[PDB]
Amino acid sequence: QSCVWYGECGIAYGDKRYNCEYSGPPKPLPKDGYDLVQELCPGFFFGQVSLCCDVRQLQTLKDNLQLPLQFLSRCPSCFYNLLNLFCELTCSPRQSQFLQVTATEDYVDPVTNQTKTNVKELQYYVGQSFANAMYNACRDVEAPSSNDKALGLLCGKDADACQATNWIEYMFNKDNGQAPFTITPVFSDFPVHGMEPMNNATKGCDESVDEVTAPCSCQDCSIVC
Ligand SMILES: C[C@H](CCCC(C)(C)O)[C@H]1CC[C@H]2[C@@H]3CC=C4C[C@@H](O)CC[C@]4(C)[C@H]3CC[C@]12C
Ligand SMILES: *[C@@H]1O[C@H](CO)[C@@H](O[C@@H]2O[C@H](CO)[C@@H](O)[C@H](O)[C@H]2NC(C)=O)[C@H](O)[C@H]1NC(C)=O
């Protein structure tokens, strides 16, 4: 198991940070991050909780959830797969299987002058099936108190032009003013030059996320009607 990053480094733009390049093994998460990991990425919350992210990154992930929540909160299955796409990118102890750093630049600690390295861009190998299921679980979600589709607000285009792969490409493009840096997705259900795409199990909008979380409504999920 190997990482491509660990912890936050320099400012990209606005209040947004690059992560620090790191190619060692995952590290057990400090106990002070257990609430965050339980909340955001409970799939990782077992054993030594050895991850390729630190507490700062998890806090940043939480803070950035506002806009997806803004439009997708009412359909938990839809939001769940999206959260997992981000959890895997941020924290997976097997990052190196599906992430490849493609651009970097120096980070200098202002006090010590010790150099680290910003991960400026990377490529993320995303399962084709994963991407399609993530889209499928979200494509009927209505924007709250409207008759329009929520994806029209998260895709940088109208819902009739939004598709699984262009949705993920848009979200991952820093030109959107939310993503701190660009992640270039590659979609494949097959290995690609030795890379094993992230193809985590997904939940449909007709399924419960867990014992305390019901399926989505008919209004947001035509399957359950
Ligand atoms: C919340 C948005 C999605 C919605 C974007 C928009 C413009 C439609 O609202 C997503 C897209 C990219 C995501 C980040 C990817 C990488 C990281 C690095 C990790 O260390 C910390 C989490 C973070 C910042 C993700 C947060 C969620 C982001 C912005
Ligand atoms: C992505 O899928 C993997 C594989 O199913 C998940 O890792 C498993 O998580 C469960 C739940 O804690 C553990 O019981 C298994 O031991 C894990 N298996 C492996 C191979 O690590 C992972 O949780 C999923 N990712 C997220 C973010 O939910």
Ligand SMILES: *[C@@H]1O[C@H](CO)[C@@H](O)[C@H](O)[C@H]1NC(C)=O
């Ligand atoms: C998802 O795909 C299923 C078939 O697997 C289909 O019934 C459904 O219309 C699709 N859309 C949604 C919103 O679930």
